[PDB]
Write a protein that binds this ligand. Structure first.
Ligand code: 2AK
Ligand code: NA
Ligand code: NA
Ligand code: NA
Ligand code: NA
Lengths: 494, 494, 494, 494
């Protein structure tokens, strides 16, 4: 049930999107976006900078003015546009999945069945919320009638990463638009193409001009410009924990814009001795190697109870050596290339530190192909908490397996981190599952599964893995500004 | 029915409160707190600094450890302890009101009937939330059971101002303690005493050691230490917008602690021509002069429709000329002194700027007594949007009256501001009231009333008046960390 | 924008709908359904009875068995099917409007622009609710993890009236299907055809067999059979109060199935002396004469303050005289015929009694045509509370205009009724609106409008106008069975 | 820590409680209430009938009038009153516990530590809800502002049973008074004394006259008069399924008042082979024998997996034989007498039935003393589904143990019942716990525990065990009438 891909899809949108129009950058500068499987340039893209962001923000501010089409629009009709957008994305599903693989590197099978399926589900879910996020009527003391209005927060700056271009765009636009906000979105320079085509679909669906504006560009230029703009009411950022800090400083430095962050992780995958061996091994493989390890909540610390450690290691090693690496448009390929040169080198550098500090390399370790940013599935064994590969986010196909004895021990070790994005627990015991799910300091805890996302269930970080939540009802909170209206009445009665 | 005050209440607590015990500062250094009615010193207070804050955060962290009495305590019993603390405050109500007046300057009548009443109601409102802030069970796709846990955010740094010492303390501790957080509080140097006595009642109530820790001191020292601490999970700040920017920068530069801000305003009070004149005059007077003008949401821009301007102004002047300034322990006193020398001078400087930039001085405008920080009820007329007194927060008993013609005009002028804490509309017309409360960009809009606060009704700013909300159900949101638990199940059914 | 009607639409569906297939009655009996504009039979329809209801319930029970396609289906996919059903209704919108007008008699323009629009909005609203009606996780005392599942109530019997055949069908299916129930629906003998056609669309949309079953037939046989059935879990009935009482008794004397009722009314439309006159007149006309007066919430007691009574009356009578009565497919027609001969007679009898008892007949009064059940727009002035036409629900184009003096008077006079479905207040004054909206004992109070329905806002009776609510989040409550799960854990922590 | 009881406690209240005053019946009639431990009369109590109920309903209705102290009272203050009542009950705990034991028969240790504790927790829980049950503001289509008020349902009839007299009174009063309703309560003739004393405390707490009225008397007279009353808006009833039918019929037959029902059950307690045997045996014993087996959700069907059956039965019989039956005031006593002679005889009837239909009597099965109504702890083994003792509620100390093999089997057999109040599952396996908790058709499913109640977690029946839920937020739903107010506005914006 996967239709055939077009392995060289035409590029139709490569410009700045403001007011449902396509614009070259003010400076006329451009930048190349690259095909990571070949390393060849796909096409040139307009390089937005502050001046282009200023244009986007003004366009958005005007679309948001009291009495505008977007503000007067019925809430139900915002839901109707979101469903229309989703129908258009479904019409062009194969195209977009192929364009995603071309620009990102992830396998086309995964793009089609996972990424675009989740885009469609996210947009259709939030379509449903548009007219259901009620304010409150409140039994305040005295002769008063008091109630809340859930207004849009306003102009929302949204900076999205390269690991899931399409899906992250959906994750941001969905809540924003459902609650009647306007956006200025900065797409990642590595993967700008799918998001710009979606902008063309946003025009086709019938969204008023300026409601969604997209400005491709670099982090320190366009990203920073959105972060520090005096008329952006809210910023939402998914990227490194390092940059997250820069984003929050920029907001305090600028106009006290509201901030939410979805950052990195070093997520513990915990395998108890009573776990289903086969299922655990396959899921822990998935937990780490999914999307070429380019996953903020990748199970990068696989904790295994000592009684089953040896069997688990041998099975994991066998599975990693069997994982097919190659052309992402091949239906047999399970792992495509990494996204770019920088990440390629970064990963190879982290593998070097693993070997340097005495972690046992059990398979892979090196480059997987002569052409493109391909890296062999790599497993380290006998990993220690103090090792660099056990502490820092690698964001590549590099597995760390650790040994533990007691449940008290692994809790302490799992939680001993400045990250807390996700975690997982594999066990057949009811009490162990509940004890561990409670104790783990993680935004999402999976029990006998991994990477189970639904648009209905919130996702986000504890500690320095981020603040605020995306998905679910919770994802609407940061896109709402609460107004209390309190009216004197002649006589208050229950 | 007000009980006669003790006009010289004994001071019992004046040190640093950590682990239900009283500590001198590591440096052993103290600072004076002044009785603003006299300019004389009440007592010395321990000057807390970074190292004292570090001790408090350690005490908070230990009390928040999994397995501790506080973490294991039933949600319902947390409510009982909050209800117990409320009873203890009510028990000592006459004393606390007197001490509030002693150290802050506000009238004893107001301290007793307004301040302590709202303290009691806040604590009792939040006691009710302890066991009712439910997470969710979520109908996710696939064979999964998914639900959310609403956990405490953890160690909460709380910085409160000097204008409502006891009430601002209750606003912070209520929602923090109801949701099982631990607290490191920084009280203002000008008004530390009442907060510190409440610490004794917190211990007497039965709160475990370290759950509430209070460290008096300066803003640049103790305040900056909390906002920048590596192991504080959350900071809530109330104060000026200037300082709010520094807090958010400090959060971003340290450990990405979650931030909420309650800041200043320049709130518009809009009087339509069909307003009840006598009610509007009295309420607009209260809106501005309440608490010696020292209200973030003070009605400092009194917009009056041109048809009723002259009459409104005459009536407003007569009310201001009759306002009794004097000893706050005298039952006839409406207005006590300003809080300290800095504010006394600051307000006088603004008064000077008002008559210098062409605003019409109608009454007052000078010092009201030769001892203490008493300022005359001052009223400016013919105030224009360009004037400093129309733009900046004076935080004193200084009234600005501006004239307007149409409803379209006043919406534009009222919203043209970087502040947006509150606003008011006075009108008998249904459509006018809905038109305005809708169009005004403010966290709270009062209709035919002003300064009506209820624990059930959220409060907080638009724009640079803040982020987040206190009071109501909304107050618990910033003190909760959300954890999704997603469990594989044999077969999901509806 | 209304496309040209096929004025004699073909009837495709006229049987019993069970397991996505069409069935003759077990007895083979059929009954005629009439075109009320002519008095002639459109076609014969299968007369469902106890035996047929027994088969429909067994099919419903089978489709509801644990592990069935319907039970295992993702909540989000239930929503997709509802939106698909809506698209299919929208596809066949012109046909459905014409068929609705043929069987019911309402003008085709109203049928197209109002009834089908509201059908579409209702279904799309509840599609959104399918995967959002969360249960809770509950901070219970002791070492336990407690939560609630919101499960479907089960086999739902749904009995709909004839005044809004398609809309009332949507009002019932929307919430029931969103929450994953199964339905045995009984449609009105006077108007079964459109509901049976929608059953074809239900099959086409993709709903599993047995999820929706429809049994056209008589009230005392097919209706009572559902209401008394030992394996039906929940009954929703919309119709007369008298039969409402029969339904609640039948639930009680069988299996204690859950009951919700949408019953009649004698709703007060209150015109204060300060209302907009032209608006009030047109809304009062609308309030009463919409759908040939066949609305449960019709403004059948129009209270007009004495200072504006004469003008209001003259204008209302002038409006009633110019109201165009005739063939509902003609574009000039504002008022169609009544639904059948019994209503035709009943309404005329109420008109007789109005003249007798001393209400001034101001216009109309009799039969409007020698063909079909057309009644003249009729107005009664100087109506007093004790009059039969002031007490009892006429359900026809017969207006009652009553005079009052004070606000205290009208509240008490309005509330002195065994009914309480809706009310309306027409005024420009803020306090009069708030005073009246609070004091009126009605499920919906409209302020400066009438018959304003939204899928998002709940609708239902006080007193004997019904119990429970439909539409909004509230309309899901009656279709949910709450399950508590409480699980022993090792150690509960916040 | 249990204070020594007064074994012959004085009676202070034995009359009808209307308008905070004590009244004899209009007929001056009284009835004796019996001490089930001795079979001797305690005292006479006023016998309320139709005329007394009518007086009570008029007092309730008067207290509910617009502008009354109770309607005008701040929501937060209702909260305060409930908290005061709880403190007064706690003050008089020893007495109330002793009185409860004297009249009902249950162990004094249990009354004091369990019943009274739960009464305090229920009332304090609902105190917290008084000012937090918000209506909604709703984004409806068009130029309208729409919102819901949550008003009180009105005059609420409350009919409570004799098995938990104090607790059941709290479960009714809490949610009703929290939401501002007024109450006419009928207490059980077997156990009216503790409720009447609490009425004194309700007066002392400061609840306005008429808010709570109590009419002691008999079911067919006083009870029926409440259910049939034309000015009662709602009836909540707890008792037998049979009488529940009578109440629903009466409600439909009169004024369509709203009905919730809490009825009997035949709850399955499922013991899987991997259960903790020691824990499972003690919990199953507690599940059945608690409160002399007079619990609606008693684990009256103990399903034990075949591999552990013989050992479980052996241990269960030994535990039954060791249960101490005696004077409920004696600290050694585990089991008191049944409540009265009617239940005494009925239980002996059921025991006889078990023997006659082939159930194997393992211990007890007879009368345990010559005085009072004491029955031997009785255990039947090898019970089959088609047996009457396996089907019908015995409401005595009679245990049914059934054998099963497969998890799929036990689901069907557990669900093959017209009841569904509760169920439990004992297992160490996560997947079995989730599979059963989902598959069991019951309002509460306990996992590895039984009879775990929390004021926070709802309770109620599936099928014929009741409808509606008490406790938690859900307990408020039945005490709320929802009013939609939809207001036309000049220009709707988001
Ligand atoms: C933000 C985000 C989204 C998705 Br889908 C993910 C991740 C992170 C992962 O780490 C993963 O495996 N899938
Ligand atoms: Na690329
Ligand atoms: Na003094
Ligand atoms: Na007809
Ligand atoms: Na008794």
């Amino acid at each position: 049930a996967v239709p055939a891909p077009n392995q060289q899809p035409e590029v139709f949108c490569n410009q700045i999107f403001i007011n449902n129009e396509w614009h070259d950058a003010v400076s006329r500068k451009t930048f190349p976006t690259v095909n990571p499987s070949t390393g060849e340039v796909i096409c040139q893209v307009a390089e937005g900078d502050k001046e282009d962001v200023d244009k986007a923000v003004k366009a958005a501010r005007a679309a948001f003015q009291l009495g505008s089409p977007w503000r007067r629009m019925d809430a139900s009709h915002r839901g109707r546009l979101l469903n229309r957008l989703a129908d258009l994305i479904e019409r062009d599903r194969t195209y977009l999945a192929a364009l995603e693989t071309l620009d990102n590197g992830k396998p086309y099978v995964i793009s089609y069945l996972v990424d675009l399926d989740m885009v469609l589900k996210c947009l259709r879910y939030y379509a449903g919320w548009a007219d259901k996020y009620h304010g409150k009527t409140i039994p305040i003391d005295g002769d008063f009638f008091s109630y809340t209005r859930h207004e849009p927060v306003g102009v929302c700056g949204q900076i999205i990463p390269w690991n899931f271009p399409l899906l992250m765009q959906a994750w941001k636009l969905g809540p924003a638009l459902a609650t009647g906000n306007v956006v200025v979105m900065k797409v990642a320079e590595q993967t700008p193409l799918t998001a710009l085509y979606v902008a063309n679909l946003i025009k086709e669906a019938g969204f008023p001009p300026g409601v969604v504006n997209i400005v491709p560009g670099f982090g320190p230029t366009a990203g920073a410009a959105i972060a520090s703009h005096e008329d952006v009411d809210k910023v939402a950022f998914t990227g490194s924990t390092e940059i997250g800090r820069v984003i929050q400083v920029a907001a305090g430095s600028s106009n006290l814009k509201r901030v939410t962050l979805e950052l990195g992780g070093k997520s513990p995958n915990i395998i108890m001795s009573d776990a289903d061996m086969d299922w655990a091994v396959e899921q822990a493989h998935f937990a780490l190697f999914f999307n070429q390890g380019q996953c903020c909540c990748a199970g990068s610390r696989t904790f295994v109870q000592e009684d089953i450690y040896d069997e688990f290691v041998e099975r994991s090693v066998a599975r990693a050596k069997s994982r097919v690496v190659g052309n992402p448009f091949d239906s047999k390929t399970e792992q495509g290339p990494q996204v770019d040169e920088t990440q390629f080198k970064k990963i190879l550098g982290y593998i070097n530190t693993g070997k340097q500090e005495g972690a046992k390399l059990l398979c892979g370790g090196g480059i997987a192909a002569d052409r493109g940013y391909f890296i062999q599935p790599t497993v380290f064994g006998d990993v220690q908490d103090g090792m660099t590969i056990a502490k820092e986010e690698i964001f590549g196909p590099v597995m760390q397996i650790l040994k533990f004895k007691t449940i008290e021990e692994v809790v302490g070790r799992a939680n001993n981190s400045t990250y807390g994005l996700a975690a997982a627990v594999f066990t057949k015991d009811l009490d162990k599952a509940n004890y561990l799910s409670q104790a783990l300091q993680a935004g999402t805890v999976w029990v006998n599964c991994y990477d189970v996302f639904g648009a209905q269930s919130p996702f986000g970080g504890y500690k320095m893995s981020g603040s605020g939540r995306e998905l679910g009802e919770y994802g609407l909170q940061a896109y709402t500004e609460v107004k209390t209206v309190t009216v004197k009445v002649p006589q208050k009665n229950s």
